[PDB]
Design a protein around this ligand. Structure first.
Ligand SMILES: Cc1cc2nc3c(=O)[nH]c(=O)nc-3n(C[C@H](O)[C@H](O)[C@H](O)COP(=O)(O)O)c2cc1C
Ligand code: SF4
Ligand code: SF4
Ligand code: SF4
Ligand code: SF4
Ligand code: FCO
Ligand code: FES
Ligand SMILES: [Mg+2]
Ligand code: 3NI
Lengths: 576, 178, 455, 234
């Protein structure tokens, strides 16, 4: 028996239930129920950001995201903290208030933001914090706080075919179609469409579905990934808010295609405000299943995460569902062969499954029409940052970056753009870069595009992402656990103004090791901001460094020669 | 012209210098090929310029840093000799703690002190660094000579290699961190 | 505090040809006459505080990284403290004799190191000789055979340590309750074969230092005398025993004040004072207060304190040293060199006899006893009495550590001796490289463990 | 062994479904590793066993052996990546060997020696965790732990379940499974497999240190490459 086989499936939900503190009497109870020692349950709890909060009547987490910082979130955090004589990360002597930080909470289009007792509060300002202070000083329950404080917008500033179709059509209209009856037909439809994953890896969905069908095991699972954790990304938030019934339809179609008795929506903690809507939309789409009730119908279920970017990783998600820390698995065996509780399992992203509902509705020709040959279909783009209209923009795959940037109406003079979140590419806003088509074959993009104008320091942006990756690393494997920390600490030195050229060059071998020796995609991802920073902002960077004549054996230039100057599904799926 | 060597003992125990001395009568042979600049063995209070600088110890205060930087300027080749210079060694075991509390512990709190004993602070005592650092944190290091201390034979093999332009090599059996 | 008319500051920083890092500052008034001079220990480790929380069995191996020349002394002191922690007082024969061989080899090699590499460049090339030649390399150029012998006396001492400890510098063999190895026949025979020649070269070095005092005794008397108590260990009998004993203090006319004092109660007997200008403390005898209760340790203190040295040639040499011209040199700053070379010869004689003992090859390696929480280890390191104090919980984790090092004991008297030498050679301004070296000569006389003091 | 594959242009037999590491080691061919053990299998954490195949760098302990599979375990790249990984393990803990009783008996140290690691180029972390010495015969130094998982697995396999690795990222550490979080309150015992499996100086016996003279310690003469299974694993 290894650590991996120490499963406790209901445990995550049971830990949610037990917090509405995690004391030795509550641990002893869960220890009984799941047949695991109390310290082992506590250890699993420690993995999750929101199970670590000191207990307090109001638990405020300011969003530590690059865009929120630009919109002045730090000053607001201090403004509230100062009123109660506490520092971020700690709690008042009377346990009334805890103030802390969390990573991007899917509110990049509505910065600056914070979560308060698991409820989002976007577009904060000095005025709101002053009112917030009054409510807390006077002990007013959140029941009675103005509902509009918690209102999350979902502005869509460009409709294309997919969005129009979602508005026009009812969710259950797809189940009348002939294709919805036949599992092989759905697979064939999706295959023909050329649908590639919208989670950020871009793996063909048909191939992934075939791997899961080719197993002898009758029991299977479809999992929908709504742990939208990539900073700057809110595309799945919109779909989950506006089009939940369509998602659950796409989950049922995907489940039938692979032969799954059960389906599970994995929803991040930060979107638990959407839970009542999703539950109601689940109820409704449960009854629209035909054929072939009652023994062939797919059960729909919803699991709530607890604060961990890495649990967005395919296998880590499953491990989380199995009641363990969210550590990516050692593969093979892959989840398609042996996944949730050993049974063949497919994980698909919210948008990917919504695309499936569309493809069954209007067929493969409809889909492949749009976008490029390799990158087929329409794509949702979540734009934010220094732009006049942040929000969702539907475009076809292959759209030039500059088109999408321009369509949002940039505020200052363009300077730099983060494509596909911190995992992707930091680019200077130059014509040749902006001409590049957003597609798997050219400049990949999960939809996230963050615009930064001339007021923004690229070195400070990478420092933000560095702290993110350092805090989010699951901690399982050497190069990522340690490398991510090395990068962050180098950027502490830069910010403190005593970093040398040696301090920077010595990261080169760490980046290489992270790229090559890591156990999941996180390790490659986490080196990209600095790699891009050195590729395109060398002089800005060097300007802040002291002199040092260190001769590297493996230099930063050699790391760049191996990467940007010439793939993520390599870690997640077997090969063809 | 003879090859010129300087040596420094910074935040070290002097033990890397005694291992250097453990070459024994080979020091007489060495003294024919080289002239010594600043060193704990010579009386030169100020360094340079020279061909090889052998640095024992890391940096624990601002003076150590000045000397180290001075030695770098002066020396063509600078060698980190021993664990302390290479990775901080024993002195850097204080880096797990705040140095202020350690002083208070030793100079005020300790039970065998005189009544009303105080942490020393005088213009004569130089500024303590927050953390003891290995020398490569400050300056460029051309060669690292591992051990605590590196053995006489490793020191002899190494500096003989440099004297004949031969590239130093560290094969498994001679390579030690203790 | 520096009352009250010192108007000019001159610094010798760093000190040269000493163990570790030290600084001396000389203070002059407007005329240019020295008011005061001071020896500063400028660096700080915090070992006593940062070693807390480590398992006790780590101590002897890790504590010795504070020095340098004196790791064996620390190694054995810590091991002796831990013997008591684990309920062992008397060691079994192989353990005792291995440790003695280790320690005698250390004192031999440290004394050879100091005299030949550090002190004798002054004493044999002249106090005002050119800086480029005033070192071991200039001594080797001119008095090569002398340097060569001294190098080999050091080597032999180090090779006794390697054989017993595992390596020359920072070994591991001394463990709580005994030793983790013995000697092979070929190791013991190899060392024994060399011992007589090394001892004869020590005879010659003692003869050399006599001739050097006969010629320059009046000149050397300028560096000062001491009217201070002498602090050391003595056996029960009560001859000098460098490895083990109980405390003995005599007055400057000594005149035994204190005798056979249990070092397990060093805390009753001693107290450490602190000045703002040095990290090195100032210990004094509690019952007498400062400065009446200050004292002096090291080679000359031991020769004065003991009734006898247990080897014949060292005993005959010691007698001549106490008699000479006419009891003055024994209490003089530069008289340490003479006393030091007598100890060198004593160690060579001790080793020459010890190496014929087959218990070194025996299997009475270690002993067990009743566990306790407190352990104190005291030993005569090359430069003076050394004290290690550890306390350990049920945990096996160290809860308390205190180290009082040989050079700390000599803090007061070294300042006094630097003062004396400052006004003897610098009140007559102006300052020159050679004249400042005279102040360094006074310091070197003590052979201060500045590394050990830096803890 | 019927089937075969290629390791460094040399033919290696294997049983299906052995991994490349299992097969390589059975054939007497070394690939560096820290968290693989013959009784416990591969944790997957250390990453020292990376090799080139298909045609990317991946972990040999997870790569299943297939017929005709072309594996490279020795190259300039792999040597450098393994060096870096070792330098990272040194950086994250307090690996002060001179004060460590496992020196000369330590797989991490030995592997660093074998990779010519003359100095760790990374700025060390100087973590501040305290020893768990609550157990009357055993102690744990988390600042020397390389999070290899072997102790946890041994304790699970023998049915004591006394240990668990908890925390995320750099907060990750070995912990007792007791309610108090003290090893003394678990069922762990000095005779357990887990009590003696640790390849480094992290989970140790009490009062058993510095018993082996210098020159006679396990890794003093040969490197891990040239050692039997009796001597390389504990
Ligand atoms: C560190 C990390 C975080 C990830 N986070 C997410 C996420 O929040 N949402 C997501 O859909 N995919 C995420 N992925 C990619 C997942 O593997 C994804 O669920 C999988 O690629 C789904 O395939 P699909 O795109 O075909 O649905 C992440 C990968 C890594 C390495
Ligand atoms: S690469 Fe990072 S996130 Fe992925 S398994 Fe390793 S430590 Fe965990
Ligand atoms: S490396 Fe070891 S021997 Fe050299 S100075 Fe440091 S503690 Fe002393
Ligand atoms: S555990 Fe190993 S690498 Fe770490 S200090 Fe001890 S011997 Fe060195
Ligand atoms: S204590 Fe030892 S065996 Fe256990 S995880 Fe740490 S390094 Fe591995
Ligand atoms: N001699 C010596 Fe060094 C000091 N003090 C030790 O022990
Ligand atoms: S042996 Fe493959 S990761 Fe440790
Ligand atoms: Mg002390
Ligand atoms: Ni010393």
């Amino acid at each position: 028996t290894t650590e991996r086989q120490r499963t406790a499936p209901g445990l995550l939900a049971a830990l949610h239930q037990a917090r509405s503190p995690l004391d030795a009497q509550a641990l002893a109870e869960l220890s009984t129920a799941f047949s695991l020692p109390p310290g082992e349950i506590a250890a699993t709890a420690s993995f999750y950001h929101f199970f670590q909060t000191p207990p307090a009547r109001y638990q405020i987490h300011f969003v530590d995201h690059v865009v929120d910082h630009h919109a002045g979130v730090a000053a607001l955090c201090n403004h509230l903290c100062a009123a109660f004589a506490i520092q971020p990360g700690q709690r008042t002597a009377d346990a009334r208030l805890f103030v802390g930080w969390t990573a991007c909470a899917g509110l990049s289009d509505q910065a600056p933001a914070a979560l308060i007792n698991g409820r989002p509060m976007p577009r904060l300002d000095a005025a709101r914090i002053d009112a917030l202070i009054e409510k807390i000083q006077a002990q007013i329950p959140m029941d009675q706080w103005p509902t509009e404080w918690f209102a999350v917008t979902n502005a869509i500033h460009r409709h294309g075919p997919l969005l129009t179709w979602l508005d026009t059509t009812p969710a259950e209209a797809v189940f009348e179609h002939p294709t919805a009856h036949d599992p092989d037909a759905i697979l064939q439809a999706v295959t023909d469409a050329g649908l590639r994953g919208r989670g950020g890896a871009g793996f063909p969905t048909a191939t992934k579905w075939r791997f899961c069908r080719e197993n002898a095991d009758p029991e299977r699972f479809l999992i929908c990934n709504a742990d939208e954790g990539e900073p700057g990304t809110f595309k799945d938030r919109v779909l989950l808010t506006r089009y939940p019934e369509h998602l659950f339809a796409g989950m049922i179609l995907a489940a039938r295609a692979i032969g799954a008795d059960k389906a599970i929506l994995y929803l991040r903690y930060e979107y638990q405000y959407l839970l009542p809507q999703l539950e109601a939309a689940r109820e409704r789409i449960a009854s629209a299943q035909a054929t072939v009730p009652q023994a062939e119908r797919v059960t729909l279920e919803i699991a709530l995460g607890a604060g961990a970017y890495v649990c967005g990783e395919e296998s880590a998600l499953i491990e989380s569902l199995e009641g363990k820390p969210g550590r990516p698995r050692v593969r093979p065996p892959y989840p398609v062969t042996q996944g949730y509780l050993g049974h063949p399992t497919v994980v698909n992203n919210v948008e990917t499954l919504v695309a499936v509902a569309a493809i069954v509705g209007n067929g493969a020709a409809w889909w492949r029409a749009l976008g490029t040959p390799d990158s087929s279909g329409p794509k949702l783009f979540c734009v934010s940052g220094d732009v006049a209209q942040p929000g969702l923009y539907e475009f076809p795959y292959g759209v030039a970056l500059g088109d999408v940037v321009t369509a949002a109406r940039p505020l200052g003079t363009r300077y730099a753009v983060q494509v596909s979140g911190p995992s992707g590419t930091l680019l200077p806003a130059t014509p040749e870069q902006l001409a590049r088509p957003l597609a798997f074959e050219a400049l990949p993009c999960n939809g996230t595009v963050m615009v930064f104008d001339v007021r923004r320091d690229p070195v400070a942006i990478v420092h933000h992402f560095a702290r993110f990756f350092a805090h989010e690393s699951c901690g399982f494997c050497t190069p990522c656990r340690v490398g991510t920390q090395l990068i962050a600490k180098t950027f502490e030195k830069i910010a403190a103004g005593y970093a040398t050229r040696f301090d920077l060059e010595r990261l080169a071998p760490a980046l290489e090791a992270m790229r090559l020796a890591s156990n999941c995609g996180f390790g490659l991802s986490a080196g990209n901001p600095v790699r891009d920073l050195i590729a395109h902002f060398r002089q800005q960077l060097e300007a802040q460094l002291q002199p040092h004549d260190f001769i590297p054996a493996f230099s930063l230039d050699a790391e760049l020669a191996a990467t940007r100057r010439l793939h993520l599904a390599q870690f997640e799926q077997p090969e063809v | 012209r003879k090859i010129r060597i300087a040596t420094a003992s910074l935040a070290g125990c002097f033990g890397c210098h005694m291992s250097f001395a453990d070459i024994d009568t080979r020091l007489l042979a060495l003294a024919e090929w080289v002239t010594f600049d600043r060193s704990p063995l010579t009386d030169w209070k100020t360094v340079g310029e020279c061909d090889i600088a052998l640095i024992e110890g890391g940096v624990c205060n601002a003076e150590n840093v000045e000397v180290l930087r001075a030695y770098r300027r002066a020396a063509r080749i600078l060698v980190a000799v021993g664990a302390c210079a290479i990775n901080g060694g024993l002195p850097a075991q204080r880096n797990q703690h705040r140095v202020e509390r350690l002083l208070t512990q030793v100079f005020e709190a300790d039970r065998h002190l005189a009544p009303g004993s105080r942490v020393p602070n005088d213009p004569e005592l130089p500024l303590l660094l927050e953390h003891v650092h290995p020398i490569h944190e400050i300056v460029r290091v051309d060669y690292y000579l591992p051990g605590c201390p590196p053995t006489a034979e490793v020191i002899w093999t190494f500096l003989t290699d440099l004297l004949v332009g031969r590239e130093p090599h560290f094969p498994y059996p001679t390579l030690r961190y203790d | 505090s520096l009352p009250a008319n010192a108007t000019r500051r001159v610094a010798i920083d760093p000190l040269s040809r000493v163990e570790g890092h030290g600084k001396v500052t000389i203070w002059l008034d407007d005329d240019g006459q020295v008011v005061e001079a001071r020896l500063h220990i400028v660096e700080f480790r915090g070992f006593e505080a940062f070693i807390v929380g480590r398992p006790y069995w780590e101590a002897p191996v890790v504590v010795q990284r504070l020095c340098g020349i004196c790791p064996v002394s620390h190694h054995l002191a810590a091991a002796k403290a831990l013997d008591r922690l684990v309920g062992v007082t008397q060691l079994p024969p192989t353990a005792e004799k291995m440790r003695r061989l280790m320690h005698y080899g250390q004192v031999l090699q440290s004394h050879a190191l100091h005299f030949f590499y550090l002190a004798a460049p002054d004493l044999l090339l002249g106090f005002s000789a050119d800086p480029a030649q005033r070192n071991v390399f200039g001594l080797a150029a001119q008095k090569r055979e002398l340097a060569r012998q001294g190098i080999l006396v050091r080597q032999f001492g180090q090779e006794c340590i390697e054989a017993t400890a595992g390596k020359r510098i920072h070994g591991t063999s001394a463990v709580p309750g005994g030793i983790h190895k013995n000697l092979s026949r070929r190791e013991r025979m190899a060392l024994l074969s060399r011992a007589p020649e090394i001892r004869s070269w020590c005879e010659a070095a003692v003869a050399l230092i006599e001739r050097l005092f006969t010629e320059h005794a009046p000149f050397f008397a300028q560096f000062g005398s001491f009217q201070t108590k002498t602090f050391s260990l003595v056996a029960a009998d009560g001859s000098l025993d460098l490895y083990d004993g109980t405390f003995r203090v005599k007055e400057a006319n000594g005149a035994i004040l204190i005798d056979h004092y249990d070092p397990n109660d060093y805390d009753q007997l001693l107290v450490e004072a602190v000045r703002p200008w040095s990290y090195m403390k100032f210990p004094y005898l509690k019952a007498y207060g400062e400065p009446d209760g200050f004292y002096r340790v090291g080679p000359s203190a031991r020769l004065i304190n003991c009734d006898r040295l247990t080897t014949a040639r060292a005993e005959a040499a010691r007698q001549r040293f106490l008699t000479f011209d006419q009891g003055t040199v024994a209490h003089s700053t530069l008289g340490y060199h003479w006393a030091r070379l007598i100890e060198m010869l004593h160690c060579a004689e001790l080793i020459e006899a010890l190496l014929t003992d087959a218990d070194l090859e025996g299997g009475e390696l270690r002993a067990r006893g009743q566990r306790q929480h407190r352990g104190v280890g005291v030993i005569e390191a090359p430069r003076g009495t050394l004290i290690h104090h550890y306390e350990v919980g049920d945990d096996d984790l160290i809860t308390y550590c205190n180290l009082i090092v040989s050079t700390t004991h000599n803090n007061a008297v070294m300042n006094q001796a630097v003062t004396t030498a400052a006004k003897a050679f610098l009140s007559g301004v102006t300052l020159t490289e050679a004249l400042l070296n005279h102040i360094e000569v006074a310091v070197r006389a003590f052979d201060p463990c500045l590394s050990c003091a830096t803890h | 062994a019927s089937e075969t594959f290629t390791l460094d242009e040399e033919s290696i037999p294997f049983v299906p479904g052995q991994t490349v590491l299992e097969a390589a080691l059975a054939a007497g061919r070394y690939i560096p590793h820290l968290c693989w053990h013959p009784e416990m299998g591969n944790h997957g954490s250390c990453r020292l066993c990376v090799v080139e195949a298909n045609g990317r760098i991946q972990a040999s302990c997870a790569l299943p052996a297939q017929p005709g599979l072309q594996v490279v375990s020795k190259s300039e790249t792999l040597t450098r990546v393994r060096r870096t990984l070792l330098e990272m393990l040194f950086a994250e803990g307090n690996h002060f060997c001179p004060g460590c009783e496992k020196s000369g008996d330590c797989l991490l140290q030995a592997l660093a020696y074998a990779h010519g690691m003359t100095a760790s180029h990374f700025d060390p972390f100087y973590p501040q965790r305290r020893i768990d010495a609550s157990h009357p015969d055993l102690w744990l130094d988390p600042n020397r732990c390389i999070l290899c998982g072997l102790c946890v697995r041994a304790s699970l396999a023998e049915g004591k379940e006394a240990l668990v690795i908890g925390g995320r990222g750099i907060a990750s550490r070995l912990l007792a499974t007791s309610a108090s979080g003290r090893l003394g309150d678990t069922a762990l015992a000095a005779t357990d497999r887990a009590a003696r499996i640790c390849p480094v100086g992290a989970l140790n016996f009490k009062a058993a240190g510095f018993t082996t003279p210098i020159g006679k310690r396990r890794f003093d003469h040969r490197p891990p490459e040239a050692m039997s299974d009796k001597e390389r694993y504990t």
